[PDB]
Amino acid sequence: MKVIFLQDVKGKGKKGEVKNVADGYAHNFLIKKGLAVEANASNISALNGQKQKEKKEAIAELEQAKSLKETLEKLTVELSAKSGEGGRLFGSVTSKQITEQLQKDHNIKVDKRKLELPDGIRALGYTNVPVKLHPEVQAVLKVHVKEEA
Amino acid sequence: RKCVITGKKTTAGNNRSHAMNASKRTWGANLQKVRILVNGKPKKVYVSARALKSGKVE
RNA sequence: GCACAAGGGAGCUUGACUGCGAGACCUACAAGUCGAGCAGGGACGAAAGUCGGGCUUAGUGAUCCGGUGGUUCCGCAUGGA
RNA sequence: GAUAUUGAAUGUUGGUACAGCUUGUACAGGAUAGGUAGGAGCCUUGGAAACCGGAGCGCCAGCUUCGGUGGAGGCAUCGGUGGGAUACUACCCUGGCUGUAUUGACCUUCUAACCCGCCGCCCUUAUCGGGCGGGGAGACAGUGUCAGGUGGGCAGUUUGACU
RNA sequence: AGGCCCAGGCGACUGUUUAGCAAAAACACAGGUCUCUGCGAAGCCGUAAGGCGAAGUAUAGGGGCUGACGCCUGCCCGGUG
RNA sequence: CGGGACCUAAGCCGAGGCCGAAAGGCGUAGGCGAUGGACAACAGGUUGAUAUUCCUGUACCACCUCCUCACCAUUUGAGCA
RNA sequence: AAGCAGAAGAUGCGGAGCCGCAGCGAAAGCGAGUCUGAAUAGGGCGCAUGAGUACGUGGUCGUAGACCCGAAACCAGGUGAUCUACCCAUGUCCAGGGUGAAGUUCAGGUAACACUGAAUGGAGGCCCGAACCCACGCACGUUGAAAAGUGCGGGGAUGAGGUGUGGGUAGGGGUGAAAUGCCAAUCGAACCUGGAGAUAGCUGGUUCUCUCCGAAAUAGCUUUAGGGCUAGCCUCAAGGUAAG
RNA sequence: GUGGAUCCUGAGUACGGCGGAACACGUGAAAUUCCGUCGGAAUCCGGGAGGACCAUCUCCCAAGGCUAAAUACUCCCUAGU
RNA sequence: GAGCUGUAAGCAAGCUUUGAUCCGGAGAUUUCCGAAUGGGGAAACCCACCACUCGUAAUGGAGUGGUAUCCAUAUCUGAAUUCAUAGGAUAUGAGAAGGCAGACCCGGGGAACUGAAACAUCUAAGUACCCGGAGGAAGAGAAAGCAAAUGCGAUUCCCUGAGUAGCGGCGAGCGAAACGGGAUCAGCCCAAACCAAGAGGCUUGCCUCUUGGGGUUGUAGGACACUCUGUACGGAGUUACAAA
What we know:
This is part of a larger assembly, with chains A and B. By secondary structure, chain A is mainly alpha-helical. Chain A has helices at about 25-35, 40-65, 95-100, and strands spanning about 85, 90. A two-stranded antiparallel ribbon of chain A has the order 1-2. In chain A, β1 (about 85) and β2 form a beta hairpin. Chain A starts with about 25 loop residues before the first helix and ends in a 49-residue tail after the last helix. Chain B is mainly beta. Chain B has one domain (about 1-60). Chain B is about 5% helix and about 15% strand. Chain B has 1 helix and 2 strands, in the order ββα. Chain B has one helix spanning about 50, and strands at about 10-15, 25. Chain B has a two-stranded antiparallel sheet with strand order 1-2. In chain B, a hairpin with a 7-residue loop joins β1 (about 10-15) and β2. At the A-B interface, α1 of A face loops of B. The structure holds 7 RNA strands. Chain A: This is Large ribosomal subunit protein bL9. Chain A: Keywords: Coiled coil, Ribonucleoprotein, Ribosomal protein, RNA-binding, rRNA-binding. Chain A: Belongs to the bacterial ribosomal protein bL9 family. Chain A: It holds the Pfam family Ribosomal_L9_N.
């Protein structure tokens, strides 16, 4: 009544049940070739590491989302003019590139797949708001501005 | 007939029936032909039902 | 064996008793039978007295094993069980 | 038979644990109101009383459920001839019900243990045995305890004395 | 190197049986019938493995009963299986 | 000649193995085992004896080349098989 | 006492223990008294009325072969189908004389058949009858020639047959055309070795002498009635005394 | 030796149900110990025993392995009785 | 240190005071059967193979060694399958199979006669007997021990307790233990936390594989940390005490 599947299979448990499991069912099938289990001290703690190892990874991921947050806010004004012209309109295309690529104007780089703006951005020059959306867990804030040339 | 994993053995006993007389009766150990690993690779060896639970992998 | 009624009829009634018991009969033993009288408390009768179940002699039996009550007894170290 | 070997599901059902709602209706309050810690508060066009039906409950007195209509309100507590006592908020319960959460019986089916005096291949020249694949069987069987039956079929003995 | 003719009971016959008291009216047999058995068999010999049945397959095997052949083989399932 | 340097039957032993409190039981491969199959010597003589054994004649089977002839072929392979 | 010394001897030394000195009650306890009982009542027992202890001899009783003789039979462990019962495998034996079936052939005969007559053919738990296998008659045998045979008859004698050789089945068993038969001259459970010196109310036998006393065959019971235990009767010893 | 902030001190075991044996103890008021069959603990604030069981108290650390000598017995080699 | 050639005492031919015959220690040879073990086998026998040697013109044949099985350690190969494994080949093995003191004690099997005046719980008994094991002793043994106060400090055996405590158709019978007195008297280690070395599954990490240190106690001991003292001239040792 104590095993650790980890590799859930229709069983009332995933990542390995730490509480009362089925018995005699694993003695010949589950354990053999299937998903070994022995929820006995030794094997337990070891799973821990992985669960243990990804407790370290949990830290990692959570903080990936929230290192990177904070990292880009105080940013110097994004001065990427989008060819403002046309008697009061623009020429430059404001969509995905200038939004994200506005970071390596010094070096750092990002991924265009993180932008957060439902509507496409009206081709203006004003305070183009850029709510950096790296991951669901963590959101950021960026800006964009157009100039005349 | 003896299993290798443990020292279980047949042990003679008696049938103490009502108005115990009582008739003799040997008691064999429980056993299974399920495969066990000795020098590689199986098979085959008998195993006690008690030892078969948990413990050594089939 | 009994009309000095133990035989029949009524009144009051439970001695149809608790501890006993000097001494004998019965005699392989086990057991069986009678008993004056002492004390505790009573019944009847005014008292005297009588009552330790039936006129007498049969109507029943071990030990072991368990059941149920009464127990200022014991109860595997000490307290209870 | 149970159990241990001893599988996975489904179906039914049980057991509980949980969430929730409704129900608890004793002269009396004022009734035909579970109580208890709080609370002096209400609630009402985020449409109130009222009715009208659906709906359940029931002490068939009443309670409730909803909505129709309605159209601006209902209270109590309190004072009270009942053990409390209510605008109520909190709590947890009485009945009931629903899900949830787990299990164990059934319930089927499958299928990797197990099972093959089944087939091929190899050991290996070998109907033994075994590997190895295939197939059928299957959570049984077989065996292991444990229990009840049947059982001269096989044993141990008795079956008196007086006369 | 056969004594025969008859008449009845029992047993079809040949055969077999208590070596060392009884050879037969006994036993057995073919036949008849019932029952069980689907193969890893029912029955078994064995704690088991193995083997018989069987290099068989319900027209085949195991067991009970009855005894060639002819005429037949009636009734009863309450009780005991 | 009979048996063994040949074979196999009933049966037995039996590596590993299958089973069994132990001892052992069972059974492959293999082996054992004639009462069977295969297999070359026949006539007279001889002693107080033993003679299809010794002997006088004629033989027969199997195997081996210091040998004697005959036929062949050098992996296009004579032959042993 | 074991034991430590000491010719494996005695004697030592070791007081661990044992028994006695006063019990009663089931115990609690109390004590020359204690118990039963409300009981300074009664009664049971013990006191009052006082000898044991350790060895030696003997009478005996218990636990052990327990006084010797004797079972049939039980269990355990082994040995044997060289006789016999049967099975398996492989060989071998059956002088001769009769009966005549199926089938076949040739003729009769039919449309073909059936059928009919001769020839041919040789089957049979067939007939007669020797080897052989048996074992029904009688007699002789019975300290026999012999632990089953002989003499004269009899049955089967080509088969459910006789028989050789080798092998198999082992005793709470095998085998058995079955009778409780057979398994080494043994069979309702074979043979030897062990438990066993089994047991036994039943049987037989207890071996030197004298002297003194001297019974009983009844009762109560008893799975007892052909045993047994107490009482009746006997004997020895110590006391009471002179009870009879 | 000083310290007790952290870790160890013998797992399918120890025990319990069922079924037996062995402990003088015959399954009962009954241990304890050793077996089979199923369940199955704490681990130092711990555990076991002290003749059911519980609390207290008193002792001891089981589920690992070693151990001479005191003791028993002679087929036998010496000597003696 | 004078006779010897066994019984065997009579017979032939010989050995020895340059010392036999004899007694003892250490050896040698040691045929064949026999656990047997090259193969088979009906015990005292047959048939071989592989190398060396003798001999033969050659075959045949004769002597010397090896060749049973299982297990253990190794070294190469190699089936379904590719790896691999099973399996096979070869080498190294005073290993193991056996015998027996009819004895003694442990383990696993294990009755019945008998007693209970029968017989079924029990007795006989865990006795006879079978098997597995050993050793000269084995078993047991250093506390989950007794036990009930000023407590005793491993087992074994002997004397006691005692025929007591108890068990028991509470029948028949069975039968302790502690304390006390003696014999002989030694007590230690393996597992587990931790350190060091080697590897290896894996996600750095990490959790077990192996080899040595560390450490083996209960008014608890040790790992860990902190103090000293040591690595000797001390102690111990082949019988436990680690091994020799």
